[PDB]
Inverse folding.
């Protein structure tokens, strides 16, 4: 859901 | 000379 | 003169992008972290799923082993790190202090300390036993992408999107050195060599560089891969021949000859960006992991 987020797996 | 030893020394 | 890594196992289980993979120092286990908020443990040699560890409130960007292979530390978007007892699955401590996403983490060799880097632009040094923040370093002017101790734990190297690598005295907290090239694009990863005298750094202009710490100059550069968007890990491979290993945004694992800087292998199999690779401590084995459209981990083996 919306909590499944991590900075390294998102592009700059 | 251009070789680098990254483990030892 | 060339390695011949070949796919041996594919490890599926994470339900979101994988963020990091690391071999335990004793060579028995692989740990993985993911945006799915989980750490998973796998057999290093056979890839067999071992267990899941959970507790973070948001996803995880990094995980790292203690020197004795008994603990892990994880870095999460929930602004905390957690220390885990691997055998029990217990969260031993939650490390609170950072004011934004925690991005990277490592134990020192003695494993009484943990170092972390965050989107809050600081590097923090934590006591493992008590879980208290010992030092906050005003390290950078942009997010901190990587942190690493040298072989004796006396130094810490940090990297940042501000274009800098900095070297810190663990005991004093003093900045001893700032590495500056002719151009300074965002630095997306950094680590010391095993002997501590060189520094391997990734930049978001498709370039890895090997620096001499003491002279403060770049000696070798490795290119041919794609890296402009993600903080992709890099490794020294030293069990067989001397290689540099890195993931790439074209879905491949790139391997370079450390000395000649030539690409010696490109490993095909992943279907999304390869965000993380690790090299096994004693055996010629590589682990790789991919982002959201793939979500699998792969184990590759070579004869040298």
């Amino acid at each position: 859901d919306g909590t499944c987020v991590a900075a390294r797996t998102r592009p700059v | 000379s251009d070789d680098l030893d990254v483990v030892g020394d | 003169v060339k390695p011949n890594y070949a796919l041996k196992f594919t490890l599926a289980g994470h339900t979101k992008a994988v963020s990091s993979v690391k071999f335990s120092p004793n060579g028995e286990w692989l740990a993985s972290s993911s945006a799915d908020k989980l750490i998973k443990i796998w057999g290093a040699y056979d890839g067999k799923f071992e267990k899941t560890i959970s507790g973070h409130k948001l996803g995880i960007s990094d995980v790292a082993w203690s020197s004795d292979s008994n603990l892990l530390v994880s870095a999460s978007d929930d602004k905390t790190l957690k220390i885990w007892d691997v055998s029990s699955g217990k969260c031993l401590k939650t490390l609170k202090g950072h004011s934004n996403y925690v991005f990277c983490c490592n134990f020192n060799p003695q494993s009484n300390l943990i170092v972390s880097g965050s989107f809050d632009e600081s590097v923090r040094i934590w006591d493992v036993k008590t879980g208290k923040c010992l030092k906050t370093l005003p390290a950078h002017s942009d997010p901190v992408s990587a942190v690493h101790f040298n072989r004796d734990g006396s130094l810490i190297v940090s990297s940042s999107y501000d274009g800098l690598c900095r070297i810190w005295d663990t005991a004093s907290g003093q900045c001893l050195k700032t590495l500056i090239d002719d151009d300074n694009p965002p630095v997306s990863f950094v680590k010391f060599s095993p002997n501590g005298k060189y520094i391997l750094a990734a930049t978001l202009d498709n370039t890895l560089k090997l620096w001499d710490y003491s002279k403060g100059k770049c000696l070798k550069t490795y290119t041919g891969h794609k890296n402009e968007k993600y903080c992709i890990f890099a490794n020294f491979s030293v069990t067989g021949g001397k290689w540099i290993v890195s993931g790439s945004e074209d879905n491949l694992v790139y391997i370079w000859n450390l000395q000649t800087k030539e690409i010696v292998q490109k490993l095909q199999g992943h279907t999304d960006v390869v965000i993380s690779t690790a090299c096994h401590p004693t055996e010629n084995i590589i682990a790789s992991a991919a982002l959201e459209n793939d979500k699998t981990i792969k184990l590759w083996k070579s004869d040298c």
